[PDB]
């Protein structure tokens, strides 16, 4: 296999960032996230996740994420992102603070569910439900590894 840490071999798209470092950069990126975005681990470690955004990315939506991060709360949005070679995809994204025992935020987990289109109605509610559950499982798993 590759040089992923064991945590990064969990078969979901996510990255984990450290808000205690300047500009809240990625410290983990799953192999699945790397396959999705076409980036290698080498070129995105230590970088803010905002490199995923491009011309069509709604800036108000991105602001919704940053508001959540500043307040150390979770959020779910749908935004347009871009692969390394610049190919558009819809990203049903979920952010959630990773806390320790006493409830203090230590890191951020971010989960991506990729799609060719903006999901709406039932299909979006189903989507929101799923990635929240995935984010919960990833949190739980990281604490075991």
């Amino acid at each position: 296999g590759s040089l992923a840490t064991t945590l990064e071999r969990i078969e979901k798209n996510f990255v984990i960032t450290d808000p205690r470092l300047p500009d809240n950069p990625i410290i983990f990126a799953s192999d699945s996230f790397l396959q999705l975005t076409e980036y290698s681990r080498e070129e995105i470690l230590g970088r803010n996740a905002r490199f995923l955004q491009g011309p069509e990315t709604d800036r108000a939506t991105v602001r919704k994420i940053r508001d959540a991060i500043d307040n150390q709360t979770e959020v779910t949005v749908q935004l347009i992102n871009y692969t390394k070679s610049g190919k558009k995809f819809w990203n049903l994204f979920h952010l959630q603070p990773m806390r320790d025992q006493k409830g203090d935020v230590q890191y951020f987990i971010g989960v991506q569910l990729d799609g060719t289109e903006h999901v709406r109605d039932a299909a979006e509610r189903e989507g929101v439900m799923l990635i929240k559950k995935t984010a919960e499982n990833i949190d739980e798993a990281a604490k075991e590894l």
Binding site: L7, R20, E42, E43, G46, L145
Partner: protein, 55 residues
């Protein structure tokens, strides 16, 4: 490229350590992310923390 193969290799090796809790592991990866030139020192020190916390 700050995150050459050696850095990545050390990084993988820190996470293999059996006696570190998830915070301790996350902290070393984070320090390595922030200061890649200290990878070897970080792995060596992680191993000492590992050896000092037997089950």
């Amino acid at each position: 490229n700050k995150f050459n193969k050696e850095v990545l290799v050390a990084r993988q090796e820190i996470y293999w350590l059996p006696n570190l809790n998830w915070e301790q592991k996350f902290a070393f990866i984070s320090s390595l992310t922030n200061d890649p030139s200290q990878s070897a020192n970080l792995l060596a020190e992680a191993k000492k923390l590992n050896g000092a916390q037997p089950p």
